[PDB]
Amino acid sequence: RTLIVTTILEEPYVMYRKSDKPLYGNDRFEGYCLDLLKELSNILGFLYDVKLVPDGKYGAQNDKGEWNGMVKELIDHRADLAVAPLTITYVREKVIDFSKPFMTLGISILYRKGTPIDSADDLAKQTKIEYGAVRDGSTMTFFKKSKISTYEKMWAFMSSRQQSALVKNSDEGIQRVLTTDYALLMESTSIEYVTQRNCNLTQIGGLIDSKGYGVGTPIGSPYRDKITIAILQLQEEGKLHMMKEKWWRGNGCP
Amino acid sequence: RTLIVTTILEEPYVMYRKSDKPLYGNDRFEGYCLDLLKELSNILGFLYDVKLVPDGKYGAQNDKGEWNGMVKELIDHRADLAVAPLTITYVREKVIDFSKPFMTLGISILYRKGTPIDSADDLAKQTKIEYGAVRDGSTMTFFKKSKISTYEKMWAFMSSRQQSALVKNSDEGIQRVLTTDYALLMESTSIEYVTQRNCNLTQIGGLIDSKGYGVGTPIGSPYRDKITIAILQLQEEGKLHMMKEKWWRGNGCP
Numbered sequence: 192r193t194l195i196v197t198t199i200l201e202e203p204y205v206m207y208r209k210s211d212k213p214l215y216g217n218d219r220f221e222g223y224c225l226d227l228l229k230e231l232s233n234i235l236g237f238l239y240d241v242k243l244v245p246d247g248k249y250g251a252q253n254d255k256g257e258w259n260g261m262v263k264e265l266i267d268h269r270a271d272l273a274v275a276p277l278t279i280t281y282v283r284e285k286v287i288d289f290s291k292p293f294m295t296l297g298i299s300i301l302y303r304k305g306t307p308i309d310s311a312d313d314l315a316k317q318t319k320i321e322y323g324a325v326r327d328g329s330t331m332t333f334f335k336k337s338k339i340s341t342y343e344k345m346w347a348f349m350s351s352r353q354q355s356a357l358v359k360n361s362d363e364g365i366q367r368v369l370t371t372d373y374a375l376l377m378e379s380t381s382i383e384y385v386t387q388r389n390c391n392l393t394q395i396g397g398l399i400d401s402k403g404y405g406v407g408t409p410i411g412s413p414y415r416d417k418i419t420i421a422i423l424q425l426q427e428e429g430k431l432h433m434m435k436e437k438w439w440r441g442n443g444c445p
Numbered sequence: 446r447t448l449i450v451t452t453i454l455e456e457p458y459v460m461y462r463k464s465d466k467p468l469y470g471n472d473r474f475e476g477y478c479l480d481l482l483k484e485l486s487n488i489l490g491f492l493y494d495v496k497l498v499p500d501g502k503y504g505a506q507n508d509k510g511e512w513n514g515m516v517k518e519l520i521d522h523r524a525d526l527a528v529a530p531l532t533i534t535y536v537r538e539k540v541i542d543f544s545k546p547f548m549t550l551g552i553s554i555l556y557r558k559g560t561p562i563d564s565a566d567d568l569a570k571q572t573k574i575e576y577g578a579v580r581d582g583s584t585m586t587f588f589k590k591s592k593i594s595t596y597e598k599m600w601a602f603m604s605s606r607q608q609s610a611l612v613k614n615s616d617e618g619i620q621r622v623l624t625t626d627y628a629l630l631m632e633s634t635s636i637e638y639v640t641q642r643n644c645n646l647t648q649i650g651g652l653i654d655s656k657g658y659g660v661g662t663p664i665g666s667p668y669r670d671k672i673t674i675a676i677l678q679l680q681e682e683g684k685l686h687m688m689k690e691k692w693w694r695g696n697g698c699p
């Protein structure tokens with residue numbers, strides 16, 4: 192049987208391809224995650240049908256404890272795999288079986304160039320520069336749950352004023368950084384992508400934490416361990432490195 | 446239960462403690478991995494007995510395909526867990542079930558400071574400076590199996606002349622870098638530890654690959670997923686970062 196793959200539009204992982212006519216099926220899409228799925232399919236010998244997650248969410252819980260997003264598609268067996276920049280977190284790993292990571296990353300800061308800001312601590316100890324994250328994503332959750340003093344202080348700020356410092360999506364965050372005195376807490380792989388395309392922006396400081404993106408599968412899936420072993424082969428062959436360079440290299444920023 | 450844990454002496458992961466009299470049982474040991482085991486046991490509620498792997502090996506295959514080391518202890522169900530800087534590789538993941546990584550790293554180069562050498566390509570394109578790796582470790586295996594031209598060239602060099610450029614263990618590699626015109630291919634977390642303590646050594650270049658250390662379990666173990674989840678909790682709480690700082694920080698370099 193052909194596997195159903197849940198995913199989400201997110202540059203440069205999954206994008207609509209450009210054409211002169213309406214597109215259908217897997218031909219709608221291109222990006223790093225499409226290349227990853229062609230390599231996984233090459234090694235493992237499955238066919239697949241890519242399906243955008245109907246609610247347009249990655250996966251978090253509502254106040255009843257019920258999941259949404261790609262994570263919920265896997266829980267409910269409406270997808271076999273999720274292939275997206277789906278952060279491997281404690282809360283999600285309890286409810287789905289993630290492969291080992293195909294990409295490693297951490298939270299960092301996207302801000303304008305030319306300023307004296309150098310770290311999260313520099314942001315935490317002040318209130319003139321606003322800062323926030325995408326609402327309900329794993330970066331926001333990291334701040335919400337942290338018991339590290341600096342990160343607790345930052346969460347107090349971000350959550351204040353009915354969460355006015357948060358944004359609904361990364362593109363909104365990026366425009367806010369570009370327009371106003373605002374720093375976005377963002378996963379470092381996305382910061383790399385953005386700062387190679389907008390030379391007025393930069394990463395501030397290093398990575399705050401360390402985590403990965405993995406392919407999601409339902410708990411008990413026979414595909415999880417097969418996909419992990421395929422990812423390790425692709426990593427060791429230098430294929431994942433090549434695929435990242437293909438999709439991230441920009442017009443170049445100093 | 447009391448779980449049986451196979452491990453290996455490797456600084457700063459597992460070391461003999463210092464004391465005036467004979468030590469016994471788990472009290473023989475300290476280091477990053479003993480701290481990790483303590484935190485895992487706190488979260489999961491198991492007792493454990495630490496046992497050094499009798500052959501003193503991590504786990505590789507002989508000419509006949511037979512495994513040794515900690516990996517073989519797990520295959521044979523002589524241990525429940527392997528807790529060590531045991532690299533998660535394609536060949537090992539086919540025969541045991543690794544947790545997700547508790548530490549992320551890559552192969553890099555250990556060399557003396559103050560030379561023109563800046564990358565693997567600089568070593569690969571010459572034959573005066575000798576370079577190699579620990580024989581039969583995952584770094585050597587990476588080079589043996591690579592089809593990337595630079596790394597094939599390096600493997601041809603490392604393996605030439607009855608593998609005279611290889612070393613038996615990391616300590617031997619470090620002494621050879623300190624004394625002679627030699628560069629060691631070494632996992633980056635070990636390079637960090639060594640360069641904190643040898644102010645005349647440095648990492649050359651970046652990481653050539655990306656991988657992790659995981660807790661090994663036999664295929665099918667119920668503990669594997671539980672330990673993954675505990676690791677993710679420890680990462681998100683900042684505890685893994687604190688543990689690394691504790692064991693890696695040196696006395697400073699002038």
Ligand SMILES: C=C(C)[C@H]1CN[C@H](C(=O)O)[C@H]1CC(=O)O
Nearest residue numbers: 249276277278328329330331378
């Ligand atoms: C693009 C977004 C909304 C996703 C991507 N990975 C994170 C996740 O899987 O939650 C989210 C980003 C973040 O929270 O910074």
Ligand SMILES: C=C(C)[C@H]1CN[C@H](C(=O)O)[C@H]1CC(=O)O
Nearest residue numbers: 503530531532579582583584632
């Ligand atoms: C200390 C050594 C022999 C081990 C540690 N991790 C690698 C492994 O698990 O094979 C080896 C290092 C290396 O191959 O550079």
Ligand SMILES: [Cl-]
Nearest residue numbers: 256257258266
């Ligand atoms: Cl649910």
Ligand SMILES: [Cl-]
Nearest residue numbers: 495496497498
């Ligand atoms: Cl022992």
Ligand SMILES: [Cl-]
Nearest residue numbers: 290291544545
């Ligand atoms: Cl896993």
Ligand SMILES: [Cl-]
Nearest residue numbers: 575609610625
């Ligand atoms: Cl000699």
Ligand SMILES: [Li+]
Nearest residue numbers: 284287288289
């Ligand atoms: Li899971």
Ligand SMILES: [Li+]
Nearest residue numbers: 538539541542
């Ligand atoms: Li495995």
